[PDB]
Symmetry: C3
């Protein structure tokens, strides 16, 4: 099935944020047996390896924005690699790496499927512009570079001349929000972007959140779905090994429910698994809990159902 | 009240599965004050004791299926004891022990009340047949022995010729599923069995799960209910001391909700509290947490309500 | 600042309503955590009214089995006057406890200025034992019985409580979070027909529906002042372990924030009580900080802090 035909891309990149270690995300996700577990559930999996992001040593900040050329070039290469995977009729699976990479992942995916809709699972909106940001970390700005409605508000940052906004504000849905800066809240509300913060998830329940999310993105017409999954969208009791953890998050059950429902549309076309940092647990078990949770979420996007799965054969007459 | 008139049956049996310690389930449940706590809650408790499961020498496997004679005999004895409790007008409360004992518990309950409905709370369907199983552990097969529709698909397994399938596929509702084998999922779907996996619980909420579960089993008219509760249906953060824990389970609150709703029907007729294994708690606190949760679940089955309880007297005069 | 974010802080370091020492350090640890400064960061107009000085009463004989009756009654008497004064200044009273016996004073004082108020009681417990139905004798499990007009006749004359005049009827109080109710309390709750949402109702409906029904019940006819009395033991002990009577199976951190965010949105919050935080009952220092941080998060959510974000009325893209 095309919903189980996958193209794996390793994106060992950390310069979109200050905490070292997130570049090992692809390594620890592979070592948990991701590819093998995907093959076990009938997927046709091709591994495109890890991108060799060459060093960009002269990389002065753009105002307070750190490592602009390195973040820009990593997303530039990733966009080219994602477009290649999409051209091969495979769902792109990007193993991160920090979430600044979503600029490239979504941009490359859009080059092949410009009609795509985005589901962004995260505790954060990642919609600060290079002028509204206070940290200067590019992993908290990817959505700003991608929105067409923000054209005019994104300055000329070195390394990003290749970026052309590819998604309208109406074609993205946030799920999991609980730590939004004032400037980000002003943008979210002014643009009228569809969102389900932890307050909406608490009000409606995840069942209704997904029914509304899929109706919002697929109601006018069926189109490719890009899911950008930041592991910090889940509560730190399931994904502690991440750089910006926030209490009161999505449960392990809610994360599986989101991805099971996205699988069943048959429209998943691109997936990002972002912000796994195996240098940031309090214990080695906290790292293993985080990686196992990310693998579990990944398997659900490609058909693993909690009710069970079976091949089309008579199990009572083998 | 008949909804609080109970017959306790200890079933210290572990040979339906490979991890030692589940035979201590009745001991640690009694040690935690279960019978005394039920009496304090206005229950009429009769203790039928702990079943003596005599060892069977040379219990050779049936193909890959382990301890068939032992499992079959323990369920045979349990069926006879449960039928005895039901004839005395009591709700049978089986303290397990591994889940293979549900063959005996449901069979004995059906000998007295053939029209019963089964609510099966578990991370697992336990519906592998002696032929579809890959572990050979009989605690993962009890539902296959009881189902009328699988008659002709279960081979002649030594120790089980006394079993007469007593439940139709329409008469069972699963709640809690999240770890189902391919063969098991094939059976669940081809039989059309009603189930609320963790996916349905997330989608609907436990309130709707119970409303649909009870409307499905009781729609037509009142009928006895058998609740078979594997403690692994709850998330391992509440019941860690169990052999097959699966994360993303029912919460402690959801477990109390299901049992409080079943109590309110006034139709609870048979109860199994299964898979408590005090040798699998990583700390003595993990053991106590599991035992405390299993006790809380059982008390809710016989009337303990979170909103409060009171006798029909005036507390202000 | 908006009326919804115009606050009067009252510290109530009182512990004689229950037997465990340390709940008197509740107002200190909440302030030490940066509470008042965090409220100012949220556009709040905060005026601190200080910690009430509670005098020692060494000749405080028990009323039958009821412990420290004069000390508890006088503590609540001092608080009713201080709450009524904050209400007269057009501010939302924010009472930092201290044990829940203080709710007699907080609600009594609030009712002196706004007698039409409605109460939302977030707790694992009903706290509706009367001095005759109580088995422990601890007044922190009896405040609601002293406040109800329907119980005028069943409450004996307890020393230190003559000033109390019941101000709320059974129709004016909604409980949320109930999971440990004595038999006498359950009899009172069901005979008075009080609206409640125990953990069973929260599981059945979800916190979304619990709040929609709660607010429709209390506000639906006419808009009125809300008094939120919040016992931290309402939330599960995985979030608020540093408390005297923890009960498992509680409200989550998310449900706590959902209740308070929804109450803020009404724009009618008039009085608030953050009760039973006992920093001496933490098994580890981590459990104490967790309970304090959670109490702080619930408090900020009552005054505008929203999980979806907050922003000033300025253009952030061209300021
Ligand atoms: O701009 C920023 O640095 C901050 N803005 C507010 C939320 C926290 C953070 C960025 C978080 C990035 B993320 O989601 O990819 O982990
Ligand atoms: O057949 C088996 O042994 C297995 N089948 C798939 C689920 C895990 C296990 C059986 C679990 C038994 B139970 O639910 O009683 O704990
Ligand atoms: O009356 C009592 O002392 C008891 N009655 C039963 C519940 C526990 C307790 C009172 C606890 C008071 B509270 O909510 O303020 O912590
Ligand atoms: Mn992110
Ligand atoms: Mn994030
Ligand atoms: Mn099980
Ligand atoms: Mn089982
Ligand atoms: Mn209280
Ligand atoms: Mn309480």
């Amino acid at each position: 099935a095309k919903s189980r035909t996958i193209g794996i891309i390793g994106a060992p990149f950390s310069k979109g944020q200050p905490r070292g270690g997130v570049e090992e995300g692809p390594t620890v996700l592979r070592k948990a047996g991701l590819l093998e577990k995907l093959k076990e559930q009938e997927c046709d999996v091709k591994d495109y390896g890890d991108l060799p992001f060459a060093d960009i040593p002269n990389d002065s900040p753009f105002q307070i924005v750190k490592n602009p050329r390195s973040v820009g070039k990593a997303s530039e290469q990733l966009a080219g690699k994602v477009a290649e995977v999409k051209k091969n009729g495979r769902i792109s699976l990007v193993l991160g790496g920090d979430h600044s990479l979503a600029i490239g992942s979504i941009s490359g995916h859009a080059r092949v499927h410009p009609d795509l809709g985005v589901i962004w699972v995260d505790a954060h909106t990642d919609i600060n512009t290079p002028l509204t940001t206070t940290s200067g970390n590019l992993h908290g700005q990817p959505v700003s570079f991608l929105l067409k409605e923000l054209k005019g508000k994104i300055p000329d940052v070195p390394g990003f001349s290749w970026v052309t906004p590819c998604i309208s504000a109406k074609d993205i849905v946030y799920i999991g929000l609980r730590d939004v800066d004032p400037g980000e809240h002003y943008i979210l509300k002014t643009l009228g972007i569809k969102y389900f913060s932890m307050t909406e998830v608490d009000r409606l329940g995840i069942g209704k959140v997904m029914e509304e999310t899929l109706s919002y993105l697929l109601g006018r017409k069926k189109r490719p779905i890009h899911l950008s999954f930041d592991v910090d969208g889940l509560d730190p009791s399931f994904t502690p090994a991440t750089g910006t953890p926030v209490v009161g998050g999505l449960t392990y059950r809610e994360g599986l429910y989101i991805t099971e429902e996205i699988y069943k549309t048959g429209l998943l076309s691109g997936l990002d698994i972002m912000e796994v940092n195996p240098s940031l647990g309090k214990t080695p078990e906290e790292v293993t809990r985080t990686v196992n949770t990310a693998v579990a979420i990944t398997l659900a996007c490609f058909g693993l159902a909690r009710e069970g799965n079976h091949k089309p054969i008579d199990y009572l007459n083998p």
